[PDB]
Design an enzyme around this catalytic site. Structure first.
Site, PDB file in Angstrom:
ATOM      1  N   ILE A 251      36.915  39.001  40.769  1.00 56.97           N
ATOM      2  CA  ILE A 251      38.157  38.708  41.465  1.00 56.97           C
ATOM      3  C   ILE A 251      38.246  39.568  42.732  1.00 56.97           C
ATOM      4  O   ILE A 251      38.774  39.131  43.769  1.00 56.97           O
ATOM      5  CB  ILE A 251      39.341  38.899  40.497  1.00 56.97           C
ATOM      6  CG1 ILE A 251      39.214  37.989  39.259  1.00 56.97           C
ATOM      7  CG2 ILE A 251      40.616  38.495  41.140  1.00 56.97           C
ATOM      8  CD1 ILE A 251      39.325  36.495  39.517  1.00 56.97           C
ATOM      9  N   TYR A 372      46.062  38.005  38.601  1.00 58.84           N
ATOM     10  CA  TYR A 372      45.266  37.562  37.454  1.00 58.84           C
ATOM     11  C   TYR A 372      44.079  38.460  37.173  1.00 58.84           C
ATOM     12  O   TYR A 372      43.651  39.262  38.003  1.00 58.84           O
ATOM     13  CB  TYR A 372      44.827  36.104  37.538  1.00 58.84           C
ATOM     14  CG  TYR A 372      43.876  35.608  38.599  1.00 58.84           C
ATOM     15  CD1 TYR A 372      43.611  36.299  39.784  1.00 58.84           C
ATOM     16  CD2 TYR A 372      43.285  34.371  38.426  1.00 58.84           C
ATOM     17  CE1 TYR A 372      42.741  35.752  40.748  1.00 58.84           C
ATOM     18  CE2 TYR A 372      42.437  33.828  39.359  1.00 58.84           C
ATOM     19  CZ  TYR A 372      42.159  34.500  40.517  1.00 58.84           C
ATOM     20  OH  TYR A 372      41.303  33.870  41.407  1.00 58.84           O
ATOM     21  N   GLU A 373      43.580  38.322  35.947  1.00 63.81           N
ATOM     22  CA  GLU A 373      42.653  39.264  35.333  1.00 63.81           C
ATOM     23  C   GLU A 373      43.198  40.683  35.428  1.00 63.81           C
ATOM     24  O   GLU A 373      42.459  41.657  35.603  1.00 63.81           O
ATOM     25  CB  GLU A 373      41.280  39.163  35.998  1.00 63.81           C
ATOM     26  CG  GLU A 373      40.595  37.838  35.801  1.00 63.81           C
ATOM     27  CD  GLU A 373      39.094  37.973  35.734  1.00 63.81           C
ATOM     28  OE1 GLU A 373      38.643  38.857  34.986  1.00 63.81           O
ATOM     29  OE2 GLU A 373      38.367  37.172  36.372  1.00 63.81           O
ATOM     30  N   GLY A 374      44.510  40.801  35.288  1.00 62.16           N
ATOM     31  CA  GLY A 374      45.159  42.098  35.380  1.00 62.16           C
ATOM     32  C   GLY A 374      45.818  42.345  36.723  1.00 62.16           C
ATOM     33  O   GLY A 374      45.160  42.287  37.770  1.00 62.16           O
TER      34      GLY A 374
END
Lengths: 389, 389
Positions: A251, A372-374
């Protein structure tokens, strides 16, 4: 230290760039406006061996390095954030946890099919009430004979509507802790789309990365074999976090790619378009805006690469941790994307507010990268935790 | 020196608040998702006198004040920045220069149907290659007997697809400057939709405010009567800048209302959602982000209000300029809106990335308020002009 690319890394970089501008760029606007999953470019990327880059040839991968995979996500996301995250999700969130925690039987069955592209991958770890929690997750896994029974839900699943195999994190053990409180232990499972009692929801209507198929995963008495458990029992949550560590680099490169392509399109625009009788690039403000952005992008680029190489060390047996490197990369790259795309669109004037130019799509695609993804706050949690220890 | 909203300004606030919450909120999603012009909203507002507020009763208005108009846009933009743009464009860009520089004849032929909502107003100054350089434009008008003829194009015209009366800035005279450089002098023209050889283009596809009808104006032998010239001949561009002075206040309240509605939906969201065993409004980070954002929003509101009050003075016979106040409001209010909207969406997490919540629509809407009707760069030129002189 060496900050120069290996003559093979320069060559794989120029391969990904050309594939991006020739086959993915001309489809970028159709994918975003029509919410269209690019099924054509995913079979094209597979025949190029791009769905397996850093995995070895002994397990079906292309034999590349992690840094080549990062350059591929960055170069793809320079023109399409949907394409870029599809490779980033399938690679670091499905293929990677199987390669790092799998038995020789699990690798042999799934990995040569993930690297080839006939099978797309996805991750389920987020739940509605507690995706950002470790105890609030409720998808359970109960023993029954020689199979596992899964019940629950997963939300914000990338590639869900078009993926073949899923890594699912369910609570298996109900244990007690040192302090006497009941703590929920999770385990990781390889779930196939053909499994009974499993269904993928309707593709979500998101602001950006719209071509990305974002659906729910529903488990209603999903009965899977016993060997589909990935890794150790009760350690499935630790597996989910180490998997997210590598997924955060993907990401971070996607955001770096979105910010990089935005600067290209903006540099190209200010040169040809005239205002006040001169080129837009002739005013001092256009020159300072672009210059400062380019420096922030190049600083973000080194953070993404430093995270990729630190993971490469951990893969080569050099026992170092790269959760902090990944965390810093996602924080600075994602904030750089939203910052650059907003200010680049500002240079296009009113013409950047219409779909004529892709900057308005980059600005939309960059906002998810902070989340997203944290989220960045979860990245700051990981960073400060290691700092304040 | 009082900073309280009178007793009637304290009331039209709730008039425009309840109306915007009940009549205008249910529709902002369809308006923005389907490029739907809220015609019903416009009809309800016409019957409420909301299209003529600070115009006196002698021309068809409601006998209001500029502030109550400024508040109307703010409360409409807190729910739908598209609806606020329709009122502000019509009011400040079409009805305003007709009353401010129009002749009794002109004031009685157009203003009654504008202030009553029967006619929708629009304004055209921007051209394809002279937007910021609005003084080097190419739409011209020449005399024909007792008619004018106009030929050219205007781009990025809010309300054009549904408007009944337009104001056009055409190049009428090419005269000499002091040191021999030829120059272009403009004049303002009231152009009806029904005029021969005038066509409105198709609805552009913008990132936000998509429900507004922004269109291109095509003048092919536009034969208009002689009495439709507005202002003094050759002084159209001064008139063009005087009309954007008021409109910049309106865009200032739109960006402010976006920031205000974004802050509203964020406080309501953080008070209920519980991630870590308690409401996300219990994190010190949630409290610090909303608090700093609220002060920024309050301070911008005072700029927006200080701008409306200076126009009321000028309008009430005092010889005062309000272009600087108008600029400082649009500069700060717009930048605030984008900064507040991106930050509030981060607080929503992945949910704010879907069409469930309005925060993704608010961010897309905020971006234009930094561009149209003079970008922040153009606003800074104005602010620097007065200061550095």
């Amino acid at each position: 230290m060496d900050f120069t690319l290996s003559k093979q890394q320069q060559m794989v970089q120029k391969m990904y760039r050309e594939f991006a501008e020739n086959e993915v760029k001309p489809l970028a606007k159709k994918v975003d406006a029509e919410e269209y999953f690019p099924k054509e470019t995913v079979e094209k990327m597979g025949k190029l061996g791009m769905m397996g880059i850093y995995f070895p040839t002994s397990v079906g991968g292309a034999g590349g390095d992690v840094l080549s995979y990062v350059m591929a996500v960055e170069e793809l996301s320079k023109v399409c954030g949907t394409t870029g995250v599809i490779v980033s999700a399938h690679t670091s969130l499905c293929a990677a946890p199987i390669y790092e925690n799998g038995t020789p039987e699990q690798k042999e069955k799934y990995l040569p099919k993930l690297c080839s592209g006939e099978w797309l991958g996805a991750f389920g770890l987020t739940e509605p009430g507690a995706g950002t929690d470790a105890q609030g997750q409720q998808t359970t896994a109960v023993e029954d004979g020689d199979y596992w029974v899964l019940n629950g839900s997963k939300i914000f699943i990338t590639n869900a509507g078009y993926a073949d195999v899923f890594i699912v994190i369910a609570v298996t053990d109900k244990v007690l802790d040192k302090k006497g409180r009941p703590t929920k232990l999770c385990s990781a499972f390889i779930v196939e789309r053909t499994d009974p009692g499993f269904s993928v929801g309707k593709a979500e209507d998101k602001m950006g990365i719209r071509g990305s198929s974002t659906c729910e995963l529903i488990f209603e008495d999903c009965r899977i074999p016993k060997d589909r458990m990935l890794g150790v029992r009760g350690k499935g949550f630790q597996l989910a976090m180490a998997t997210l560590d590598g997924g955060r680099i993907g990401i971070a490169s996607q955001a770096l790619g979105i910010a990089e392509g935005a600067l290209q399109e903006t540099v190209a625009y200010v040169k040809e378009r005239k205002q006040f009788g001169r080129s837009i690039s002739a005013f001092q403000n256009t020159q300072f805006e672009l210059a400062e952005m380019k420096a922030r992008i190049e600083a973000a680029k080194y953070l993404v690469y430093a995270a990729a190489l630190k993971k490469q060390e951990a893969m080569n047996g050099a026992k170092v941790r790269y959760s902090v490197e990944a965390a810093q990369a996602k924080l600075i790259a994602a904030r750089t994307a939203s910052d650059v795309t907003r200010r680049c669109l500002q240079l296009f004037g009113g013409y950047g507010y219409t779909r004529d130019y892709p900057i308005e799509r980059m600005m939309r695609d960059a906002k998810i990268t902070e989340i997203y993804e944290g989220t960045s706050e979860v990245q700051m949690m990981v960073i400060s935790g290691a700092l304040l220890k």
